[model samples]
Target: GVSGSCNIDVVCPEGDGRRDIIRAVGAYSKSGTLACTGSLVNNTANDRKMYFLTAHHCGMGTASTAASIVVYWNYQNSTCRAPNTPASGANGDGSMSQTQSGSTVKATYATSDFTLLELNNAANPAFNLFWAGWDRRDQNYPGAIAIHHPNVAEKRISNSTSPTSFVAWGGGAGTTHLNVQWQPSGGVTEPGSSGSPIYSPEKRVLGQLHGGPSSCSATGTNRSDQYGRVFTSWTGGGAAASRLSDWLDPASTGAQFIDGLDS
Candidate 1:
């Protein structure tokens, strides 16, 4: 079973404007806060266009209809806050002095429990964020790294050498069902860590941070521990980079858009 509450810290940079953004965004009841550590990928479409991928659930519950929501770029010391105001039929960035285009969402694949966000800002035009790559899926026991904006710390990165596996429980079944094992250690995941990217050491995209039982250290009545799950990736992240590709080019139809809401 899962045990202990998520012991996450909010550490924003000294003057990055993440602190105020987090405060304005507030905290999540189940996850505490909506923050997670993530890096940018090197793959660029035109040296100016790249994809920003992360967990889908991270942006869940955030005001979808609001004009702007708070976002912390490198929330480590709580420096600055981006208003992220949304425009009618368009997404706007409140954190920057200029207008940026982007979209937000809550969940994807129903049971997959992943979220993705897209940004088209001049600051990150050439991929300002460092995106980690994914490892070969065919390999056995692929190691993974999870980066997210924790409630206590602005940004945190964790490494797991264990193999990627799945679990089953008495939850939904069939086309709309999913079950995965839980971790008792609960050392990594915490509040505001949702939507964080779980990348392989090779910097390959893996999975998004999903909720577990209660805390990252305690067991729950469901006999499951708290840990992030990786079920939403496209065809289960692997050498193909299918999931990563889809995120970068979501304009194509039938592509999975990680963010739950569309601007």
Candidate 2:
């Protein structure tokens, strides 16, 4: 029930990718202390569908609507360390914004731990947010990094670049989630980090964080973490809401992979 006691600022993540990671909540009234993390995901249509991707649990498992939520864009700190310092740029304090709101869950699957939402209002164009790219073919990168708001605090990140194995999660079947191990800096995800996207080395999203045993313990140990597989969620299970092929590629571009864009 706390933000990352050791989480850093958005400077840790490379590029404007941090702009895409916004703070959102269920009928939220404020930031920190019960807030969930999520981001904008672009699709092939190039229409800025405003697809917000996060854990099904974040939206309380298919029980959320755009009108019942508030999303905050540019909530990062002005400098590194991600502290309570004055916010910078178009960003302000951890206040809510109406730009990224009004979403309905179009697809969600528990096995892969994903909830695909369509935003009623696009992330305001001035925000300069970049929807992340994705890999539906289950492709592997050298390693991956995750940017999130851990413990309801400022933005923090985690990564594993040595190539880990996809493991079973919640007692489910093959490749349900990708794994991230401890880093040399002793950084790790905490309670509020759930639903943050794990991006591949190529900067395309590979999975959504599903929380694991790993933590920023006092000792430096390679604790393990798991991210629900975006590729598996792409076509997971037998139900309609359990898959993502239709909503993500509304135009049916037949692309196995795509680059993230801001338009």
Candidate 3:
């Protein structure tokens, strides 16, 4: 149960452009392989490469595992549900029908727990997908907005009005992760939240959800979670196959930040 969780459909007010950015996230699965969350990422080229980002621990460390991934888009409730509602059948409305299959691992880095994959096929245009922009500046950003699927349920939105800090986790360097403390108004992170994208106040992707001791009851204070910072993953291992630099800025544009794309 996601205590204080708000359905994505209800979180955004009318005409908020961020709604499109939030749509960039997708609930993850691998046809019996696993269930997690991922997002379509925008690159400096704007070529619409279908570069998807998620936690490396989500099981795409190899080509075969990458090929098994299936991302479910627009899986949200039709009506806004109250916070703390149980996520289950009917409560979580939306289709698993809109899915994108197969991907080739472009980069995988354990240091920051990131796996960058190129989807075999572009997501259906009918999906009206958004390629989320990101910040790779190696700095902390205020506030947090995470659109993810907890427990493999429909997409949900959670936020922290608090500022984030850089910290190490799971053997990574001291600045490899972003620490967030969820507000009582916003919900807490859960198991299936792994691999989900976390956004900064500017709506640029800051990192991907790793894990933490956060739960429903812990709020306003120590209810913190860690996200693998996108900056650390930029030059991860300093190799094309283990870093995001080459893939995210193929032309070597040297861009430190990018804006979202709608198509």
Candidate 4:
């Protein structure tokens, strides 16, 4: 019923300016679990990798993503507990075994319905508590931060600024394979908050939500409610964060496999 899909248009009405940098980094995900949302990417050897990004159809079959998918950054209690020490698991390196190569969509780009997980983990732990950093070559950012876990609620933070745009028009041109676009105003994204992130505030990251426009309730007919979108790896969907500086620089991707394990 309330699954996903949206796309209308009107324009003019942007003003949240990233509510205090998403309350100093928002977080929440523990009820029934489905990866509320998260982001930070760089690994072409440039290092700086951390990705809890969401919606590969929400990991397709669950178990979150096969093994070790227990992210709880700044969660601040809502209903998901089990972290005495569950740390890293999604490319930032907590090591459950590590295995998440990238660039394998092949077709799907209406205007950034993105997907790219190139995290092979090389024994992480440089500075990754909940990881957040994703800036895509500057689209004029002075604000952004939206960590999420909305469904039982309790893990909410919101902020928005920097050349934002979207309003309302029709609503019938999404889901050819995930085509999204509809962030009318303030908070309005639900259903386990699909793949949420949308950060900025110098914290970097710029998109992830991946579904919105109307449905939680305006009438609730549910076609996913026409359109609301957020799937941006940045402008063209990949290699932003200041151009990855050589993929985060792990001595240029060649330490000859030590921790990434090749033994």
Candidate 5:
């Protein structure tokens, strides 16, 4: 039986926002499994397009890799507090309603570890899946939360709410990264959480998980982490293939910030 209290529960700190995020878990016939956390990002067009946002290090996008990608939604428990085991037959897992056979890479940039996927299908409200809005400016958000599935386990949350360890970080010639001092007392991201969205206090996405020093352990208190800044990844190197504006903005709306929408 799966055991853990980290499951997303609406009554928890950000339970409402938890449903918006999904788990990307797929099994390959030859390989064993691939797991990562992803957010359904909102676009200005409101076109109902399935824009699945994740980290470049997490598969790097494509129909082949995306084939049979299963996205689990509303996977949380009924209570909110430090994790606890669930009752019998009451598995604390999300629904696997919106699985996609394959998807196309709308855009990808490894420099910032951002990868966008246009899923083979659009979202259906019956599935309880929704989109997340984003902020493109280079300003530091006061604090942020990253909801994700750590170690291929159930959904979990990590937090960083003070001081910027990294701003507009890029391994190269762009603002490609955002490092944060993880509030280890709260939580820290783990392996399977890669590609998870880092949401600002406004509840808008600012970046995706890449890698970091923080690790989950009995003694892993106060370990920091790293994230690929979404802003710098938006228009890295000013190239179409390397940027996100063309597809995300599509109509040239020229609008800076956008909010999430439901199907």
Candidate 6:
């Protein structure tokens, strides 16, 4: 189970501008095994295209693995619950009954620990999924919020009030990560949080969760989490097959920032 009260139910947080982003977060399994969290991101056109972003480590950058990805949507508690509730006690009203299967890996870059995938089919309109937006500018943000599933549990949210620091993590060349420290009183990240997007103050995704020591028991710098910078992944490997720029901005609109769109 995740540390005592470190995982906040997605419904618990008040409706900040980032609330819609929670609809995009989903828990995914690789080859039928619960693995990580990821989100459907919007593109420049707001076409409702199904572009997914997650950590490369969670799901390998291969076609077979991509095909095995089953993303569970709306698997979150419908009612606000105390953040300190036990994992089992905080049952989600939603079900894993809503899911999408199969995808094709469009790009995978290890340098930034990012893997972009295109679902074989667009999400069913009944699913009511939101396409979260992102920021490609290379800079730090004042604070961050992440929607993820810890230990493959129900959807949860975590936040940090501190400004992120640009740093190199996992030896991925130059500073390719943003380091965030969760406020001691708020939610914290866990293993299954991998690949979840971290949103900036403007409610646009800044990066995907890589890994860090942050946990309920950790304090001070030990509570910090690192996310792969989206900026690094934009031009990664300098090719259409290895970066996000091509697919996210398929029309080559050259837009650096995009806002979330509702389906």
Q: Per-model C-alpha lDDT, please?
A: 0.36, 0.64, 0.80, 0.35, 0.64, 0.84
Candidate with more favorable, higher TM-score: 3 or 5: 3
Residue clash pairs of candidate 3 = none
- Tens-digit lDDT track of model 4 for 1-263: 11211211001112144333333232223333434443443333333344334444444223323233444333333222221122200112112221222221211223444333332343234322333434443233444445554552334443334344332323443322222322333334566665565554455445555565444233332312211233232223344431223333335533211111010
- Candidate 3 lDDT, tens digit per residue, 93-178? 56778887888999999878999999899768899899999999977767878888877777777777888888899424499999
Clashing pairs in 2: 2-151, 3-151, 4-150, 66-102, 66-103
Kindly report which residue stretches of model 3 are placed more than 4 angstroms away from their true locations once superposed: 1-15, 85-90, 170-173
- C-alpha-based local distance difference test score of model 2: 0.64
lDDT of 6 by residue, 26-142 (tens): 888899998998898999878988899999888657999999989998887666667655652444565788988999999999878899998888779898899988999978888
39: Cα error in model 1, Å: 5.7
lDDT (Cα, tens digit) per residue for candidate 1, span 1-263: 11122322233132132222122111122233334433333232223232344444444323351113333453332222221112111221222222233334322433444434433343433323333333323232455544555442444334455564553323433321122233334235555655555554444454555554534445543422222333334443342332444544335444222221111
Residue 190 in candidate 6, Cα distance off native in Å: 0.7
TM-score of 1: 0.51
Residue pairs in clash, model 6: none
Where does candidate 2 stray beyond 4 Å? Answer: 12-33, 63-67, 82-99, 170-173, 218-222
Model 1, stretches more than 4 Å misplaced? 1-50, 58-69, 77-108, 124-128, 135-142, 168-186, 214-216, 219-232, 235-263
Model 2, range 72-178, lDDT digits (tens) per residue? 66555555543323221123234334334456777888878887777677566566677778877665567777777676455566656567567787424557888
Q: What is the C-alpha RMSD of each candidate to the true structure, in Å?
A: 11.5, 4.7, 2.6, 17.7, 4.3, 2.1
RMSD of 3: 2.6
TM-score leaderboard ranking: 6, 3, 2, 5, 1, 4
- Scored against the true structure, residue 157 in model 6 reaches a CA lDDT of 79
Ranking by lDDT: 6, 3, 5, 2, 1, 4
Assess candidate 6 and give its lDDT. 0.84
| Alpha-carbon lDDT of model 1 | 0.36
Instruction: lDDT winner between 5 and 6, please give it.
Output: 6
